[PDB]
Amino acid sequence: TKPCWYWDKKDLAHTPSQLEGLDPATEARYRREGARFIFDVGTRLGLHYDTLATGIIYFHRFYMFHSFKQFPRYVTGACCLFLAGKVEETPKKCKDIIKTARSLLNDVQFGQFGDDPKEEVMVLERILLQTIKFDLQVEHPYQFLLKYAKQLKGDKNKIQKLVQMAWTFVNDSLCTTLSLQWEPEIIAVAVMYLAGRLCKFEIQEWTSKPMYRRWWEQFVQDVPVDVLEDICHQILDLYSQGKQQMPH
Amino acid sequence: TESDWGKRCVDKFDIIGIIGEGTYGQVYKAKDKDTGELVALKKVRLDNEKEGFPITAIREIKILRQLIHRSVVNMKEIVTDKDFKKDKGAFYLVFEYMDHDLMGLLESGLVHFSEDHIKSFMKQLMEGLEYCHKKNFLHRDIKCSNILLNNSGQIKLADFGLARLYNSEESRPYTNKVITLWYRPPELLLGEERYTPAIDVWSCGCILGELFTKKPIFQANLELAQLELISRLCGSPCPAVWPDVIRLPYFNTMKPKKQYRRRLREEFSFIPSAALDLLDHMLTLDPSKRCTAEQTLQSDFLKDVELSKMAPPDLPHWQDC
Amino acid sequence: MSYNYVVTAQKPTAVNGCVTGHFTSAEDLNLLIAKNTRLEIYVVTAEGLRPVKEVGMYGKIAVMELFRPKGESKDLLFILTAKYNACILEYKQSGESIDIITRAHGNVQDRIGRPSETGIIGIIDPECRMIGLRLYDGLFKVIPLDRDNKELKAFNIRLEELHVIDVKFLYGCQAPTICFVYQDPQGRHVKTYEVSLREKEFNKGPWKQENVEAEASMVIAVPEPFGGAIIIGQESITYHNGDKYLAIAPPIIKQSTIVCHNRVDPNGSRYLLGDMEGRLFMLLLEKEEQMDGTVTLKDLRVELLGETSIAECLTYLDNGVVFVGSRLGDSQLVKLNVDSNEQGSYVVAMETFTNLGPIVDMCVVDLERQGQGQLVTCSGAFKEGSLRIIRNGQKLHIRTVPLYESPRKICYQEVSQCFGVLSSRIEVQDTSGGTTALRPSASTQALSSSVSSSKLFSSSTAPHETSFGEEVEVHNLLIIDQHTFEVLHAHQFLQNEYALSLVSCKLGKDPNTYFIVGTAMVYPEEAEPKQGRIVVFQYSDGKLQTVAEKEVKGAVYSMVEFNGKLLASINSTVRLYEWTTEKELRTECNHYNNIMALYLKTKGDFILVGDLMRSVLLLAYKPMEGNFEEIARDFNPNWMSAVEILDDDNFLGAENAFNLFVCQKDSAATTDEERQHLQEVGLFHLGEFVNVFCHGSLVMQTSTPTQGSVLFGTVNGMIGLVTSLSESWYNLLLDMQNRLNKVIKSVGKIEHSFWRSFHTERKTEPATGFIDGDLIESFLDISRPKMQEVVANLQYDDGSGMKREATADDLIKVVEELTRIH
Numbered sequence A: 001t002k003p004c005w006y007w008d009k010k011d012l013a014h015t016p017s018q019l020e021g022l023d024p025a026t027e028a029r030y031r032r033e034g035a036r037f038i039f040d041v042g043t044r045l046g047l048h049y050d051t052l053a054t055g056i057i058y059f060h061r062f063y064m065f066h067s068f069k070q071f072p073r074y075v076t077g078a079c080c081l082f083l084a085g086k087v088e089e090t091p092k093k094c095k096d097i098i099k100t101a102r103s104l105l106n107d108v109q110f111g112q113f114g115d116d117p118k119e120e121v122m123v124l125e126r127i128l129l130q131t132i133k134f135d136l137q138v139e140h141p142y143q144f145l146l147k148y149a150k151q152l153k154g155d156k157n158k159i160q161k162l163v164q165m166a167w168t169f170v171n172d173s174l175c176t177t178l179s180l181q182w183e184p185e186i187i188a189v190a191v192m193y194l195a196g197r198l199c200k201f202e203i204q205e206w207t208s209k210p211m212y213r214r215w216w217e218q219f220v221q222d223v224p225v226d227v228l229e230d231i232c233h234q235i236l237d238l239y240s241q242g243k244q245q246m247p248h
Numbered sequence B: 001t002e003s004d005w006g007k008r009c010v011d012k013f014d015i016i017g018i019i020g021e022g023t024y025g026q027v028y029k030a031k032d033k034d035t036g037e038l039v040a041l042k043k044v045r046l047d048n049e050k051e052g053f054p055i056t057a058i059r060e061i062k063i064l065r066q067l068i069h070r071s072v073v074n075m076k077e078i079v080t081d082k083d084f085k086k087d088k089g090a091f092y093l094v095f096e097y098m099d100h101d102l103m104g105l106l107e108s109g110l111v112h113f114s115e116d117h118i119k120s121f122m123k124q125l126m127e128g129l130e131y132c133h134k135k136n137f138l139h140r141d142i143k144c145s146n147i148l149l150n151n152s153g154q155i156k157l158a159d160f161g162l163a164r165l166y167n168s169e170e171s172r173p174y175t176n177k178v179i180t181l182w183y184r185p186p187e188l189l190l191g192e193e194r195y196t197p198a199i200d201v202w203s204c205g206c207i208l209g210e211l212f213t214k215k216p217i218f219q220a221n222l223e224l225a226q227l228e229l230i231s232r233l234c235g236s237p238c239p240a241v242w243p244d245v246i247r248l249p250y251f252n253t254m255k256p257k258k259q260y261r262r263r264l265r266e267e268f269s270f271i272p273s274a275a276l277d278l279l280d281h282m283l284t285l286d287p288s289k290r291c292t293a294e295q296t297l298q299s300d301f302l303k304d305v306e307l308s309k310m311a312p313p314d315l316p317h318w319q320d321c
Numbered sequence C: 001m002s003y004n005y006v007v008t009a010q011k012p013t014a015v016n017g018c019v020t021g022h023f024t025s026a027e028d029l030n031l032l033i034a035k036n037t038r039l040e041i042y043v044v045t046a047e048g049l050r051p052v053k054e055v056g057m058y059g060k061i062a063v064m065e066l067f068r069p070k071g072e073s074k075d076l077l078f079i080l081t082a083k084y085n086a087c088i089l090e091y092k093q094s095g096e097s098i099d100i101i102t103r104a105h106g107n108v109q110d111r112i113g114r115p116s117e118t119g120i121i122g123i124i125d126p127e128c129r130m131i132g133l134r135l136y137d138g139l140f141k142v143i144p145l146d147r148d149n150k151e152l153k154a155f156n157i158r159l160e161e162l163h164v165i166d167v168k169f170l171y172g173c174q175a176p177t178i179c180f181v182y183q184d185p186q187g188r189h190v191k192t193y194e195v196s197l198r199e200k201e202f203n204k205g206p207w208k209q210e211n212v213e214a215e216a217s218m219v220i221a222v223p224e225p226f227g228g229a230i231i232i233g234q235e236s237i238t239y240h241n242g243d244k245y246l247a248i249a250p251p252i253i254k255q256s257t258i259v260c261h262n263r264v265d266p267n268g269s270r271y272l273l274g275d276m277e278g279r280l281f282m283l284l285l286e287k288e289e290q291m292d293g294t295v296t297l298k299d300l301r302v303e304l305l306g307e308t309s310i311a312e313c314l315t316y317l318d319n320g321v322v323f324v325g326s327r328l329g330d331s332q333l334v335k336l337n338v339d340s341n342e343q344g345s346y347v348v349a350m351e352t353f354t355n356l357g358p359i360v361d362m363c364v365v366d367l368e369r370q371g372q373g374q375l376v377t378c379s380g381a382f383k384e385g386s387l388r389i390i391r392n393g394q395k396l397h398i399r400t401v402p403l404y405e406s407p408r409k410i411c412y413q414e415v416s417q418c419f420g421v422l423s424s425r426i427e428v429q430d431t432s433g434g435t436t437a438l439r440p441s442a443s444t445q446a447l448s449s450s451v452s453s454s455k456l457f458s459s460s461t462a463p464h465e466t467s468f469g470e471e472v473e474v475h476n477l478l479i480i481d482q483h484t485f486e487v488l489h490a491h492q493f494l495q496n497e498y499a500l501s502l503v504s505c506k507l508g509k510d511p512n513t514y515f516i517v518g519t520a521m522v523y524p525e526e527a528e529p530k531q532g533r534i535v536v537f538q539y540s541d542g543k544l545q546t547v548a549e550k551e552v553k554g555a556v557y558s559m560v561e562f563n564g565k566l567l568a569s570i571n572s573t574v575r576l577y578e579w580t581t582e583k584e585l586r587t588e589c590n591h592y593n594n595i596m597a598l599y600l601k602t603k604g605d606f607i608l609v610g611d612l613m614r615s616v617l618l619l620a621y622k623p624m625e626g627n628f629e630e631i632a633r634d635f636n637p638n639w640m641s642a643v644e645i646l647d648d649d650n651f652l653g654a655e656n657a658f659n660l661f662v663c664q665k666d667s668a669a670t671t672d673e674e675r676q677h678l679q680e681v682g683l684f685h686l687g688e689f690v691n692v693f694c695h696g697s698l699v700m701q702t703s704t705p706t707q708g709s710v711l712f713g714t715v716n717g718m719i720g721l722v723t724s725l726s727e728s729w730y731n732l733l734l735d736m737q738n739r740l741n742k743v744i745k746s747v748g749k750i751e752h753s754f755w756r757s758f759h760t761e762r763k764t765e766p767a768t769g770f771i772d773g774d775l776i777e778s779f780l781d782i783s784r785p786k787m788q789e790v791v792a793n794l795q796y797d798d799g800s801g802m803k804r805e806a807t808a809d810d811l812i813k814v815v816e817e818l819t820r821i822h
C-alpha cells in the first residue's frame, strides 16, 4: 500500500554517497547545505513553512537512493522546492526559483546548474517523482507541535516560550537526518521535551493528567525516553558544532 | 513492493481503446496482462516542459491516495513508458474501470431511474462527499460526467483534478469559478472566491433534480443567464434570504431581471415529498443555510436507505436495441 | 467544416392521426389526415374523398383536434408539435386562393418537467372553454380558450396522480370535468376532477374512483344521452357513471390488443374498435328508457365486422364509409354493410392508399439494367409486411409484394437473379405444445422449404417454460425471384433464434456466391443475448444449402464484406473472419471497445462502427500487422439508429431523437488526440427516424452542384437523399434560406430555424452544415413579388466573380437543377 520512509541510524553508513567514497562528515555537510539552500531560497520567495519542509523531506529521501557525486545537491534542492510548491499548493515558476538560486549562490556553486539551469531542474522532476515513489503527501512536526500545545493549559507566556523554542528546534531538525529516522509526531514531542528541559518547565502539570510524569504518552504512544534523548542529543550536537547557541 | 510506484512499465497492460479525452491527457481502457482486471489509464505528459508535471494530476495523486471510500475512485498504481535528460516518455495513472458514466447514461437517454434507484445513487454520492468533506477536501467540479457507475449499481466519484483542502479557521484566496456553469453555485457566480464545502452540495442537488427530470435543471451559456434561471426557481438573491450577499463582489453588478420568488416546491411538485425537502435544502441560496453532506444523509429520503440493496439502474440491454 | 444537402424524395406516408369535422366550411364534412409534419385536408363525397389542401408544418404533429367555440361559423383546428409549438388554425378561401390562418400561437414548454410515459395528450372541453394538455408527469396544463389569449398562455395545476394512462373531457357535467385512468403501486384506477378556470385548481370530481383492469388502455367519453365514460382494456370493457357500472368481457377481444376507437352515432349508441390483428368491431350501447323519461345504459355488446389494416386511427365518415389510418400498413377506405357477405364479413375494401410503412431495411439495384436504380424496401409489419419496388417515372412508381409477415433485412444477389430477405412471423403457443401461425405468410408459402438442424445449441439444460397463448417470433430466410417476386425458398431458423444481419458476397478464393446470416438466440430471461450463429448458405438449383456455421458468444447485429473477409459485430466485439480453403470461417482480429456494436460500414480498409450510446468510431484494418487500429471517435454521446460513410473524411449518423449529424476527422496532426477526436461539424433535426442508409440514386443517369448520393428510409415511410456541396454552393444556399425564412409564412408561425435545431430532451443546438432542400425547393412555389424580394442584394462568391448580383430568374434555374437530383 504505502512505502516505508524511515531508516535506522546504523543504515546511514551505507547510503550511495557513503559507498562512493564520501565520508560521513561530508554527506552530513552536503545535507545541511542542501537543506539550508532549500530553506533560504523558498524564504526569499515567501513560501509557507510546510512547503519548505516538504521540499527538504523530498531532498533527504532522494539521497537515500542516489549519490551526491552524481546528482548536484543545489539542482536537486531547486527541483525539490519546485515540486513541493505544486504539491502544497504554493506554486512557483521554475524560472523564479532559478533567479533566486542565482542570487544566493556564488558562481562556482551555480555552475552545478550547467549551461541551462531551468532545463537541468525540470529534467530532474522525472527522477524525483520516481524516487519518492509518488508518495507526495507529507506530514511535518509543526502541525503536531501546535495540536499538542493546544491541549496544554497554564501560564500563557511559559507555554508560548515552549512553543517558539520547540518551533526553532523543528526548523533546525530539517538539516539533520532525523526526518529520515523518526515520524513527525515523535519529532514534535522530542522538541517539546527538549524545550522543557532547557526552560526548567514541568509539562505534565499543563496536561489533563498532571500526575502522569511521562506526559508525552497521551500524545504519542509507545515512545521511550531513549528515543526522545537520542533526538535531543542530535539537535543539541548541531548547536554545539556551530557557533550558534540554544535559543532560550 | 506494491508501494513502489512509477517503476512498473505500461507494457503490462493491453490497451483496448480510448474511453475519453482527459484534461492532462486522454483516458484509455486496458486489461492487465497478469490478472486480467480491466483498468483505466490516464496519460500524464510532462514533455511540454512549460511547468513540468501537471498540477491537476499532482492533486489527484496526492488526494486519492489519502482517500479510501467505496464511493471514491481508487488509483491502483502509476506506470511509465519504456539518459534521463533525453527521456520524454509519459506516465499513466491506473484506476479501476467503470462501466458507464452518468452523463453518458442520460445523454443517450437509455436509462430510466426509479425512486429507489435514485435513493441508492444519492446515498452513495453523499457518503463519498461526506467522507471527502470530513477529510477537509473539496472536489470543486461535480458533474454528471465525473459521476461513474458500474452495472452493479455502485457509484464512485472521480476527476479530483480541481480539488483542494478547505480551512475553516483561515479562509484563503481561491479560484473564483471552478465548477461547470450548469452545476455552479450562485456564490461562485457572484465571485465569493472564499468558497465553502457547500459549493459541492449545490452541484449534487442539481443532479438530484436532473435524475427526476432526466434534463439538467439550470442550462445556460453565460454566468448572468445562469443566475437568472437559478433565481426563477430558487428565488432572486436578496439580503433577506442571504444576509451576506451584499459582501459578494458582483451582487450589485449581476442582478436578475426581477426579484423572483422561490418556486422550487411548485415546479418540482411531481418530486416525492421526502426528496423535495432535500432539494429545497440542497438548493439554498445562502451557503451558510445550505445543508451539509452529513445532514443530507440524515434526511427522511436517504437515512433509511439500505446500501445492501444497491438497486442497479436500467443499464443498456438488448430490448433497448 | 463540412457542407451537406438533405432533400425529401418521398413524403411521410404513415397516418399518425385523423379527425373529422367542418373545418373548410360550416357546411362541408372534412377529413383531416395528419402524417408526420404534413396535414392533408379532404372533403367527404359519396364516392370517396376530394382533396382540397395540403400544408407542411415546421414540427411533428402531436395533437390535432377540431372544435367550434361559440361565435364561430365553422370548426377551428388546434395543433401542438412534438417540440411544444401550439397554434390555432383557420381555413380561409377567397375564390381560387386557399390559405391557412394562424389565429393564435405560442410555445408551451416548461423549464422543469418530466415527459410522461404515454406521450403528449391533448383534449378540448365540450363547451370549448379550455384546452387540456398532459405534457409532464404530475402536471396538468390548461390553455383557456378566451378571445384575448392570442399567445396561448397557460397555467399548470398540480396533479397528485403521477402516472396517467389516458385522459378525456367528459360530457354532461356542470363544470369542465376530466376523467382519466392512472397507475400507482396498487393497480390502475379511474378518477375524476373538475377544472376551475377561476380558481386555477382541481375540485372534487363528480363520481368516485373505481379500481379498473390492470391493462386499462383508453378512455372513451360517452355523449350527452348516456353520459359517463367507457374504459377499454385487454380483456374487458367497462362503463362508469356515478352509481352506474357495467362490464362486458367477451373472449374475442382478448386475442388481440385494441388500439383505436371512434364514434359512429353522435348520440353514442355505436363506437368502432380496432385491434393489432386488423379486426374491426362494433361496440353497441343498448338503451333502456325509464318511465321517468330518462335514458340509461342497459348493456354493452361487441360484434365483429371484418378485417382492415392495422389502424393507428379510425374515423367514420358517412354511409358505410370508414377511413382506416394505418401506420404499419396501407391506409384504406372501407364500406360497412348491414348484410354480411358469404364469408361472414360486413367489411369490403373500397380504396387502398399506399403507405411505405416502417422501412426496416432497403437496397438499390438496377434490375432492368437501365442505368437508373430501383429501391426495394422492407416495409410494413405483421400482416402488412411487404416488399416495395420503387422507380422514378412526375411521380414515383411503386410495386407492392405482400408478405403477410414482418420483413427485417434485404440484400440482392445478382448471380442468382433473386433477393435474400429475412422475415419473422408470429405464432402462438397451442395445446399441442408447439405453436400455430395466425395466418399463412411468405415463409409458409415458399415453393421449397428447409429448417435448420444445427446441433450447436442442442446442449439444452436450460429451463424455458411455455404457457398457452403466448406469442413467439419465427425467423426465416426468404429467397425471392427478382422478376416475379415469388417466394422460391424459405429457410426457418432454430427455435428462439433471431436473424439480425444478412449479406450476399464471395469470400476469399471461393468462387461461390453465398447468403450469410448472423443470428442471436433470444431468451426472455437474458438482458443481452449470449449465444449466436454465423451461417453460410448457398442458393443453387432452387435449393438452399447450409455450407458452414460458426458459433459466436453473442448477437451478430451487423455484418459486411471486407475485401474478401467477413466483418461482423458480436455484442461489444467487432471481428474480422477469413474464409479458409476448407470453407470455414477463421478469426483474424478483434476490437472490443464498444458498449454495443449495432451498425457497421466500410470504405476501403476503413470501418465505421455505430454504438448504442457511444456514437460513431472510425476503425482501420492494418494489413501489415493483421489487426484493427482506432483512428478516431465521436466522444459526444448519441443513441445511434443508422450510420453511413459519406467520403474518406466525412461520416453520417442518425440519432434516436430524429436528428442527423456529420463527423469528420479533425485533419490536425499537431497532437495525436486531435486526430483521435471526430468533431461533429454538421447538426440537423430531420424529424424522422432513419433505419437504413444506402448509397445510390433513383434518377435516370447536367453535372449537378451536389456531389454524392445517399438515400435513407424512415419509420414513417419518408425517403430522403443526402448529398455534399462545395463551400461556395453551401454559403449561397444558406444565405438564401435566411432570406426565404423572412419571406415565407409558416403555418402556426413556427420559426424555421427552431424547427431544424438539433434537439434532445437535454440539448438544443442550432443547425449547422445542412441545407434544408425542401426550403430551397419551395423558392419555385412562392409568388413572383416574393421571389424578387428574396434575391435583393444577393452576390455570388468564389466562382464566376467574387461579387455577382443574382436575379429571380437565375435562381429559378439553380433550384430547378437541384430538383433533378431526386
Ligand SMILES: CC[C@H](CO)Nc1nc(NCc2ccn(-c3cccc(Cl)c3)n2)c2ncn(C(C)C)c2n1
Pocket: B018, B019, B020, B021, B022, B027, B040, B041, B042, B073, B094, B095, B096, B097, B098, B099, B100, B101, B104, B145, B146, B147, B148, B158, B159, C593, C594, C595, C614, C633
Ligand atoms: C475522464 C472523464 C471521465 C472521468 O471523470 N471518464 C472516465 N470514465 C470511466 N469509466 C466510465 C466510462 C466513461 C466513458 N466510458 C466508455 C466506455 C466504453 C467506450 C467508450 Cl467510447 C467510453 N466509460 C473511468 N474509469 C476510470 N476513470 C478514471 C478515474 C481514470 C474513468 N474516467
